[PDB]
C-alpha cells in the first residue's frame, strides 16, 4: 500500500535545494540524470511523498547531516497521481534537514511536453537537432523526481552535458563550462532564486544570439543561426518593457539574465520560464518592411505577457491551479496596459475590446462555468487552461483599475509583490492587498467574489425618468423562452456639458441621483465593466439620435459597445432588430476603426446565418445596405500599407468586406494587383494590408488557385503562406475544398496543425458549409487520434463546423451524431455549447427573421 492516497503532496516534508545533473544525448532521445534534493521536515513522517513519471530509478540514497554516509531506502509508485514514495530508514523529525539523492534513466519526450526533442531542416537540407522543456501543468516530474507543486518552491542548480556545437541554456546564468576528456562540454549554471518547479527550464540546441546589456541585466534572444536578423524588433521591445514593468512594479528584475528562445518547431511550448522565456519561432520573427501591423501587435503583446510573469506569477506564484485564471489574467491585462503607455501607436485597446466582446458571448452560454472552481482532479488541472478564463480575468482586473484609481491599482500590486515575494499565495490575498491600500473603506474581496464564484455576467437595465436614473440587475440569461448579485462598479457619461461619475450597485434595484436633467446617458464607459446595459425604449432612442448629430461626443470604445450590445440584445428578443440597424445608420459619419469592425462583425454573422438558411436575396440586401452606409469610407481607401496602425486595419476590414461580397470596384482592383503578382512569379510586392484580399479574389480561378498552391509548398514566410492558405480555402470548387481538408489530415502538402484553420474557412462559406461538417463526421475517429478530446483543436473544429446551423433538423442531426459516439463525447463542453448555439440561432430566426423580410425589400 502506497503511504499517500491524495492528489496533493503532504504538507510535511518541504524541498529547499535541488542539484540536477543531466546527460542528454538527443540523437538517441534518451537522457540519464541524477538529482540531489535537500529537504526539511516540519512534521514527523516515515515516508517522503514526491513526484516522478517514466523514470528507471537506479539508486535512491537517504542521508542526514549527522553522517557523511549514504543510506538505502525503498521506493514505491502510484502513477495515477505521478507520486513516488521514499520510505525512510530514520523517522524524519521536525525542523531537521535531510538529503535525498536519486539516480535514474529516462527518455526525452516527443510530445512537446516535459523534456522534449525534435529535428529540423536548416538553410541546407541538414538534420539539426534541438531539445527544450515545457512543464507548465504537471510535466516537471517527467524529467526529474521532485515536489511538483508550485507552492513547494526551492533553489535549483542545473548541470547538463552537451556537445560543443549545441548551446546549452537554463534559467540562471552559466557558471562553469568545463571540457571533458570524452570530447564533450559540461555546463553548470548558477544556483537559482526560490522558484516553482513548473518554471524550471533547460534547452540544448544549435543557436546564436542577439544580446544587449542594460543596467547589468543582459537581455538576449536566441534562435537558429539563419534567423538572427529577424529578432531585432523583439529585443527592442523586450527592453522597453523590462524598463516599464520594473518601474511599474517598483521591483528590479530578480535575476541577471533574460533569455528569449525561438524554438524551431511549430508545436513548441511558449511558457513564462524565469530567465529562459520560451516562444515559437514565428512568434518572434518580424521584419519592418515585410510583416504586417497585426504581425507587429502579436510579437509586441506576446513579449509583454511573458515579461509580466517574471514578477506576477514567478516571483509571486499561485499555490494551486484553481487560480491560474488570475496569473494569466493579469498578464493578459498587462499586455494591453503596457502597450498603451509605451506602444500607444498600435491602438491595442481595439484588440482588448474585441477580445472582451467575444469573451462575453461564450461566457453568456449556460455551458459557461465560474472561473474559481475546485481542482481535485488532473483533468480539472488541464481544463483550467482556458483562454476564456484568462480573458475574463483581465476583464475583471480592468473593472478594478477603472473603479479604483489607476494609482490605487499599482499601490496594491507593488505591496502585494513585496509582501508575498519569493513565496506562494491564493487569489484572495491580492484582493486583501487592495483592501489595505483602500484603507478598509470598501471590500474588494467581497466585490470580486461575486464575479469569481459566479457564472456569467450581469445585465444592467437602465431607465432615466427625469433626473433619477433607475438601475436594475439581472443575469444575461439567453434561453429567453440560482444566480446571485454582483457588486457592479457603475460608470456613466451624460450631456452641452459633460459629466462622468462612478457608483456601485450592490442590490437588484438601485437609483443613481443626477445633478441635472440630461438628454442622453451612457452606462459602462468604454466597456471597462464586464456587463451589458439594456436601456429603455426612450433611452436607447436618445443615443441612436446623438449618434446622428455628432457621434464623437462618445469614444470609439463606447460607440462600439453600443453596436455590440444592441445587436446581442436583439438576438435574445429584448430589442427589435430594426433598432440595431437604426443605431448603425449613423455609420456614414464614422471614421474610427473599432465601431466599424464590430458593426461589420454583427452584420456578417447575420449574413452567414441567413445564407446557410437559403435566404440569399435577403442576405444580399443586408450587405448592400451596410455598403451604402459605408460607401464613402470604402471608396476613400487606398490599396497600400500606409497610415496609422488603426487606419491600416480599417482598410483591411473594409476592403475584405467589399471584395467578399463583390461590391464596387474592389474585385477588379484586386485581380489586377493579383495578376501582376502572379506574373512576377511572386517577386512583386503586395501591400500586406490588402494581401489576403488580393489572394482570395485571385484564388477564385483555377489558374490563380493553382499558382498559390505552388507558392505555399515552396516559399518561406509562414505568415504569407497562411494568407495563401486562407485564400485557397476561400474557393468555391467543392472538390478543391475537400482536397485541402483531406490533405491536412493526412499530412500531405499542408500540416495537420493547420486543419483547424481549413475546416473553419471551408465551413463559413456556402459551397463548403455542409462539406466541412461532413468531413468532421466522417473523419472523427482519426481526428480524435490526431487531437485528443477536450483539446482546443477539437473544440475549434466542432464549433467551426456547426455555429452556422439554424434549423431544428440540424440540431437533431448534430445531437444524434455525438450521442451515437460516446456518452463521454456527448458531455464534452464543445458539443454542449455547440448544441446550445444552434438553439440560439434557431430562436434568432424565430424572433427576427420574418420581421427582416419586411423592412428589407421595402
Ligand atoms: C439617491 O436618492 C435616493 C432617494 O433618496 C436614495 O435611495 C434611498 O436610499 C436609502 C439609503 O439606503 C434607502 O433607505 C433604506 O431602506 C431600506 C428598506 O426600506 C424600504 O423603504 C421604502 C418603504 O417604506 C421603500 O421605498 C424602499 O425601497 C428601496 O429598497 C428596495 C429593497 O431594498 C428596492 O426594491 C427599491 O427599489 C428601493 O431601492 C425600502 O424597501 C432599509 O432597510 C435601510 O435601512 C438599513 O440601511 C441603513 C443605511 O442604508 C442603516 O442606517 C439601517 O440601520 C439599516 O441597516 C434604509 O432605511 C431608501 O429606501 C432608498 N429609497 C429609494 C426609493 O431607493 C439613494 O440611496 C440615493 N443614491 C445616492 C448614490 O445618493
Ligand atoms: C473623426 O471625425 C471627427 C468629426 O469631424 C473628428 O473630430 C474633430 O477633431 C478635430 C481635431 O481635433 C476637432 O477640431 C478641433 O477642436 C478643438 C476643440 O476640442 C479646437 O481647439 C481646435 O481648434 C484648433 O484648430 C482649428 C482648425 O483645426 C483652428 O481654427 C483653431 O483656431 C484651433 O487652432 C479644432 O477646432 C473637431 O472639433 C472635432 N469635431 C468633433 C465633432 O468632435 C475626429 O478627429 C476624426 N478622427 C479621425 C481619426 O480622423
Ligand atoms: C550521443 O551519442 C552519440 C553516439 O550514440 C554521440 O555521437 C557522436 O556525435 C559527435 C558529434 O560531434 C560525432 O563527433 C564528430 O566526429 C566526426 C568524425 O566522425 C568529426 O568529423 C566531427 O568533428 C565530430 O567530432 C561522433 O562521431 C558521434 N559518435 C558516433 C557516431 O559514434 C554523441 O556525442 C552523444 N552526445 C552526447 C551529448 O553524449
Ligand atoms: C501580508 O500578507 C498576509 C498574508 O500572508 C496578509 O494577512 C492577511 O490580512 C488580511 C487583512 O485583514 C486578512 O483578511 C481577514 O481575515 C480574517 C480571518 O483571518 C477574516 O475574518 C476577514 O474577513 C478578512 O478576510 C487575512 O486573513 C490575512 N491572512 C493571513 C494568512 O494572515 C497581510 O495583511 C499582508 N500585510 C501586508 C502589510 O501586506
Ligand atoms: C518561379 O517560381 C518557381 C517556384 O514555384 C521557381 O522554381 C524554383 O526556383 C527556386 C529558386 O527561386 C529553385 O531553387 C534553386 O534550386 C537550385 C537547384 O535546382 C539551386 O542551385 C538554387 O540555388 C536554388 O536553391 C527551385 O529549384 C525551383 N523549382 C521548384 C520546382 O521549386 C522558378 O525558378 C521561378 N521562375 C523564375 C523565372 O525565376
Ligand atoms: C523509452 O522508450 C522505450 C520504447 O521501446 C520504452 O520501452 C517500452 O516500455 C513499455 C513501458 O515501460 C514496456 O511495456 C515495453 O515492453 C517496452 N518496449 C521495449 C521494446 O523496450 C521505455 O519504457 C521508455 N523509457 C522509460 C524510462 O520508460
Ligand atoms: C551574443 O552573445 C555574446 C556573449 O555575451 C556577446 O558578446 C559579448 O558582448 C558584450 C556586449 O554585450 C561584450 O562586452 C563582450 O566582450 C562580448 N563577449 C563575448 C564572449 O563575445 C554578443 O555581443 C551577443 N550578440 C551578438 C549579436 O553576437
Ligand atoms: C504551449 C504548448 O505546450 C504543450 O505542448 C502543453 C502544455 N503547455 C501550456 C502553456 O499550456 O500544457 C497543456 C495543457 C492542457 O490542458 C492540454 C495540453 C497541453 C500541452 C500537451 C500535453 C500533452 C501532450 N502534448 C501537449
Ligand atoms: C534500469 O536499467 C538497467 C539497464 O540495463 C537495468 O539493468 C535495470 O534492471 C533497470 N531497472 C532498475 C530498477 O534498475
Ligand atoms: C536547514 O537549512 C537552513 C538553511 O541554511 C538552516 O537555516 C536551518 O537551520 C537548517 N536546519 C537545521 C535544523 O539546522
Ligand atoms: C541598476 O541595477 C541596480 C541593481 O540593484 C539598481 O540598484 C539600480 O537602480 C539600477 N539602475 C537603473 C534601473 O537605472
Ligand atoms: C444549464 O446547464 C446545466 C448543466 O447540466 C443544466 O442542468 C441546466 O438544465 C441548464 N439550464 C437550462 C436552462 O437549460
Ligand atoms: C489611507 O491612509 C493613509 C494614511 O497616511 C493616507 O496617506 C492615504 O491617502 C489613504 N488612502 C486613501 C485612498 O484614502
Ligand atoms: C471603378 O472604375 C471605373 C473605371 O473608369 C471608374 O469610372 C469608377 O469611378 C470606379 N469606381 C470606384 C468606386 O472606384
Ligand atoms: Zn502567461
Curated annotation (Swiss-Prot):
GO molecular function: aminopeptidase activity; metalloaminopeptidase activity; metallopeptidase activity; peptide binding; zinc ion binding
Broadest EC class assigned to this enzyme: hydrolase
Cofactor note as given: Binds 1 zinc ion per subunit.
Keyword Transmembrane: yes
GO cellular component, one term: cytosol
Record-listed Zn(2+) binding positions: 305, 309, 328
Topology class, membrane: Single-pass type II membrane protein
EC number: 3.4.11.3
Annotated compartments: Cell membrane
Binding site for substrate: 136, 269-273
Record bears the keyword Transcription: no
Function: Release of an N-terminal amino acid, cleaves before cysteine, leucine as well as other amino acids. Degrades peptide hormones such as oxytocin, vasopressin and angiotensin III, and plays a role in maintaining homeostasis during pregnancy. May be involved in the inactivation of neuronal peptides in the brain. Cleaves Met-enkephalin and dynorphin. Binds angiotensin IV and may be the angiotensin IV receptor in the brain.
Record protein name field: Leucyl-cystinyl aminopeptidase
Organism: Homo sapiens
Gene name tied to this protein: LNPEP
Region of the whole protein represented: 160 to 1025 of 1025
Amino acid at each position: 500500500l502506497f503511504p499517500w492516497a491524495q492528489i496533493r503532496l503532504p504538507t510535511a516534508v518541504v524541498p529547499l535545494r535541488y542539484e540536477l545533473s543531466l546527460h542528454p544525448n538527443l540523437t538517441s532521445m534518451t537522457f540519464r540524470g541524477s538529482v540531489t534534493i535537500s529537504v526539511q521536515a516540519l512534521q514527523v513522517t516515515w515516508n517522503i511523498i514526491l513526484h516522478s513519471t517514466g523514470h528507471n530509478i537506479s539508486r535512491v540514497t537517504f542521508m542526514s547531516a549527522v553522517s557523511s554516509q549514504e543510506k538505502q531506502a525503498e521506493i514505491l509508485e502510484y502513477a495515477y497521481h505521478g507520486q513516488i514514495a521514499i520510505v525512510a530508514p530514520e523517522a524524519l523529525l521536525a525542523g531537521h534537514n535531510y538529503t535525498l539523492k536519486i539516480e535514474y534513466s529516462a527518455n526525452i519526450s516527443s510530445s512537446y511536453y516535459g523534456f522534449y526533442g525534435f529535428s529540423y531542416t536548416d538553410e541546407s537540407n541538414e538534420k539539426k537537432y534541438f531539445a527544450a522543456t515545457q512543464f507548465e501543468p504537471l510535466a516537471a516530474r517527467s524529467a526529474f523526481p521532485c515536489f511538483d507543486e508550485p507552492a513547494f518552491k526551492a533553489t535549483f542548480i542545473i548541470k547538463i552535458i552537451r556537445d560543443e556545437q549545441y548551446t546549452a541554456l537554463s534559467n540562471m546564468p552559466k557558471k562553469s563550462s568545463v571540457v571533458l576528456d570524452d570530447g564533450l562540454v559540461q555546463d553548470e549554471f548558477s544556483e537559482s532564486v526560490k522558484m516553482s518547479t513548473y518554471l524550471v527550464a533547460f534547452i540544448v540546441g544549435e543557436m546564436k544570439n542577439l544580446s544587449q546589456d542594460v543596467n547589468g541585466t543582459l537581455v538576449s534572444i536566441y534562435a537558429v543561426p539563419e534567423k538572427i536578423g529577424q529578432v531585432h524588433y523583439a529585443l527592442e521591445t523586450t527592453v522597453k518593457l523590462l524598463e516599464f514593468f520594473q518601474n511599474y512594479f517598483e521591483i528590479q528584475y530578480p535575476l541577471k539574465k533574460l533569455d528569449l528562445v525561438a524554438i524551431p518547431d511549430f508545436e513548441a511550448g511558449a511558457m513564462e520560464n524565469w530567465g529562459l522565456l520560451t516562444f515559437r519561432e514565428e512568434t518572434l520573427l518580424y521584419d519592418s518592411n515585410t510583416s504586417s501591423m497585426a504581425d507587429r501587435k502579436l510579437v509586441t503583446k506576446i513579449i509583454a505577457h511573458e515579461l509580466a510573469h517574471q514578477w506576477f506569477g514567478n516571483l509571486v506564484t499561485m499555490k494551486w491551479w484553481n487560480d491560474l485564471w488570475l496569473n494569466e489574467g493579469f498578464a493578459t491585462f498587462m499586455e494591453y496596459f503596457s502597450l498603451e503607455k509605451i506602444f500607444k501607436e498600435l491602438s491595442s485597446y481595439e484588440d482588448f475590446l474585441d477580445a472582451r466582446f467575444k469573451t462575453m458571448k461564450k461566457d453568456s452560454l449556460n455551458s459557461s462555468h465560474p472561473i474559481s472552481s475546485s481542482v481535485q482532479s488532473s483533468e480539472q488541472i488541464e481544463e483550467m487552461f482556458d483562454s476564456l478564463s484568462y480573458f475574463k480575468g483581465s476583464s475583471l482586473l480592468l473593472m478594478l483599475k477603472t473603479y479604483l484609481s489607476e494609482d490605487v491599482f499599482q499601490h496594491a500590486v507593488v505591496l502585494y509583490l513585496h509582501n508575498h515575494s519569493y513565496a506562494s499565495i491564493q487569489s484572495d490575498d491580492l484582493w486583501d492587498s487592495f483592501n489595505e491600500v483602500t484603507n478598509q473603506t470598501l471590500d474588494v474581496k467581497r466585490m470580486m467574489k461575486t464575479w469569481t464564484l459566479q457564472k456569467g455576467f450581469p445585465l444592467v437595465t437602465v431607465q432615466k425618468k427625469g433626473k433619477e436614473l433607475f438601475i436594475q440587475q439581472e443575469r444575461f440569461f439567453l434561453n429567453m423562452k440560482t444566480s446571485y448579485l454582483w457588486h457592479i462598479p457603475l460608470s456613466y457619461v451624460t450631456e452641452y456639458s459633460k459629466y462622468q461619475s462612478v457608483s456601485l450597485l450592490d442590490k437588484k434595484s438601485g437609483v443613481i441621483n443626477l445633478t441635472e436633467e440630461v438628454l442622453w446617458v451612457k452606462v459602462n464607459i468604454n466597456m471597462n465593466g464586464y456587463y451589458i446595459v439594456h436601456y429603455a425604449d426612450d433611452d436607447w432612442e436618445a443615443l441612436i439620435h446623438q449618434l446622428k448629430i455628432n457621434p464623437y461626443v462618445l469614444s470609439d470604445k463606447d460607440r462600439a459597445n453600443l453596436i455590440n450590445n444592441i445587436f446581442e440584445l436583439a438576438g435574445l428578443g429584448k430589442v427589435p432588430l430594426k433598432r440595431a440597424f437604426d443605431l448603425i445608420n449613423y455609420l456614414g459619419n464614422e471614421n474610427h476603426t473599432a465601431p466599424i469592425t464590430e458593426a461589420l462583425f454583427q452584420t456578417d454573422l447575420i449574413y452567414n446565418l441567413l445564407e446557410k438558411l437559403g435566404y440569399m436575396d435577403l442576405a444580399s440586401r443586408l450587405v448592400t445596405r451596410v455598403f451604402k452606409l459605408l460607401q464613402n469610407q470604402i471608396q476613400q481607401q487606398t490599396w497600400t500599407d500606409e497610415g496609422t496602425p488603426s487606419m491600416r486595419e480599417l482598410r483591411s476590414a473594409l476592403l475584405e468586406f467589399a471584395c467578399t461580397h463583390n461590391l464596387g470596384n474592389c474585385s477588379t482592383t484586386a485581380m489586377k494587383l493579383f495578376d501582376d503578382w502572379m506574373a512576377s512569379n511572386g517577386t512583386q510586392s503586395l501591400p500586406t494590408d490588402v494581401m489576403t484580399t488580393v489572394f482570395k479574389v485571385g484564388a477564385k480561378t483555377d489558374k490563380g488557385w493553382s499558382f498559390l498552391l505552388g507558392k505555399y509548398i515552396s516559399i518561406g514566410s509562414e505568415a504569407e503562406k497562411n494568407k495563401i492558405l486562407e485564400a485557397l480555402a476561400s474557393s468555391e470548387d467543392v472538390r478543391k475544398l475537400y482536397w485541402l481538408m483531406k490533405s491536412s489530415l493526412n499530412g500531405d502538402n499542408f500540416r495537420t496543425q493547420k486543419l483547424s484553420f481549413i475546416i473553419r474557412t471551408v465551413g463559413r462559406h456556402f459551397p463548403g458549409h455542409l462539406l466541412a461538417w461532413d468531413f468532421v463526421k466522417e473523419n472523427w475517429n482519426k481526428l480524435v487520434q490526431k487531437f485528443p478530446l477536450g483539446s482546443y483543436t477539437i473544440q475549434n473544429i466542432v464549433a467551426g463546423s456547426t455555429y452556422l446551423f439554424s434549423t431544428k433538423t440540424h440540431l437533431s442531426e448534430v445531437q444524434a451524431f455525438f450521442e451515437n459516439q460516446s456518452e463521454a463525447t456527448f458531455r464534452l463542453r464543445c458539443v454542449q455549447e455547440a448544441l446550445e448555439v444552434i438553439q440560439l440561432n434557431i430562436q434568432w430566426m424565430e424572433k427576427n427573421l420574418k420581421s427582416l423580410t419586411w423592412w428589407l425589400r421595402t
